[PDB]
């Protein structure tokens, strides 16, 4: 749980610092598959599975 919290905080600061990625990631869309693919291509290995 501590690792999960640290990883999530790191990701939050990453999104805050990188405005464009969060903007792209926030637009509502009927199909989320492109967003999921974007996340996986971005940080599939950087963070844990949970």
């Amino acid at each position: 749980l501590t690792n999960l919290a640290d990883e999530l905080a790191s990701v939050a600061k990453l999104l805050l610092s990188e405005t464009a990625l969060n903007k792209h990631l926030a637009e509502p869309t009927d199909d989320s598959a492109p967003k999921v693919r974007l996340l996986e291509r971005l940080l599939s290995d950087k963070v844990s599975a949970t």
Partner: protein
């Protein structure tokens, strides 16, 4: 969690994922605003 410019390599693959079709976002008084249609 340092991330390089690789985001550009991924975000571009995400925008390029999407016959252009836009969506009405607001309408009134005979004026309608449409999101999308980048090439209009």
């Amino acid at each position: 969690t340092i991330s390089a410019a690789d985001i550009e390599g991924a975000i571009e693959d995400y925008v390029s994922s999407f016959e252009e079709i836009g969506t009405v976002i607001d309408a009134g008084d005979g004026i309608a605003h449409v999101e999308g249609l980048p090439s209009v």
